[PDB]
């Protein structure tokens, strides 16, 4: 929904680093997560596929189960309390950016990967929270 930042890995992470350091960050994807960690930023929540507190969840590709939605809500609960949470998904977390935006505090940056293209960065605001609810 937000802004795509283009470039070969890891140049987009380097471009946005200053912004990532000044806000809480949620990462969706193994490549996104790893790349944010390696520039010294610790996500409050990181969701990635199986191949800090750990939560496990199964989510069949191209769905948003009730279980994923609960795990994400729980994650944000734990993050409110200053835990970093890694959600390890068995299945696929292809849609997980939507709930991330729903349940997130305002001013949170959510990142996910645009295959081959770059990194999508989303500033969490009442508008984009509104539409993400609509998307579901
Ligand atoms: N050009 C470019 N593409 C990127 C960049 N970061 C991520 N992407 C793309 O986004 C894709 C998806 O990222 P992830 O979802 O983290 O990767 P994944 O292997 O699907 O990880 P899982 O979702 O855990 O299975 C990657 O395969 C890349 O092609 C970047 O900095 N530049
Ligand atoms: Mg992915």
From Swiss-Prot:
Changing residue 13 to F: Strong decrease in activity. GTP binds at residues 7, 13, 30-32, 49, 51, 93, 116. Changing residue 59 to A: Decrease in activity. It catalyses: 3'-dephospho-CoA + GTP = GDP + CoA + H(+). Pathway: Cofactor biosynthesis; coenzyme A biosynthesis. Changing residue 93 to A: Retains a very low level of activity. GO terms for biological process: coenzyme A biosynthetic process. The keyword Amino-acid biosynthesis does not apply. Keywords: Coenzyme A biosynthesis, GTP-binding, Kinase, Nucleotide-binding, Transferase. Disruption phenotype: Disruption of the gene results in CoA auxotrophy. Changing residue 112 to A: Strong decrease in activity. Optimum temperature is 80 degrees Celsius. Optimum pH is 8.0. It comes from the Archaea. It is an enzyme of class 2 (transferase). Changing residue 48 to A: Strong decrease in activity. Its EC number is 2.7.1.237. GO terms for molecular function: GTP binding; kinase activity. Changing residue 92 to A: Strong decrease in activity. Catalyzes the GTP-dependent phosphorylation of the 3'-hydroxyl group of dephosphocoenzyme A to form coenzyme A (CoA). Can also use UTP, with lower efficiency and has weak activity with ATP, but shows a strong preference for GTP as the phosphate donor. Monomer in solution. Belongs to the GTP-dependent DPCK family. This is GTP-dependent dephospho-CoA kinase. The chain holds residues 19 to 167 of 177 of the full protein.
């Amino acid at each position: 929904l937000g802004e795509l930042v283009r470039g070969p890995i890891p140049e987009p992470y380097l471009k946005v680093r200053g912004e990532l350091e000044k806000h809480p960050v949620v990462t969706v994807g193994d490549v996104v997560t790893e790349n944010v960690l390696k520039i010294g930023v610790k996500p409050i929540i990181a969701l990635y596929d199986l191949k800090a507190v750990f939560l496990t969840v199964t989510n069949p590709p191209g769905t948003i189960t009730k279980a994923l939605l609960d795990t994400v809500r729980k994650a944000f609960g734990l993050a409110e309390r200053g835990r970093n949470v890694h959600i390890l998904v068995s299945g696929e977390e292809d849609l997980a950016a939507i709930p991330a935006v729903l349940y997130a505090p305002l001013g949170t940056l959510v990142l996910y990967g645009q295959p081959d293209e770059g990194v999508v960065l989303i500033k969490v605001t009442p508008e984009c929270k509104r539409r993400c609810a609509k998307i579901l």
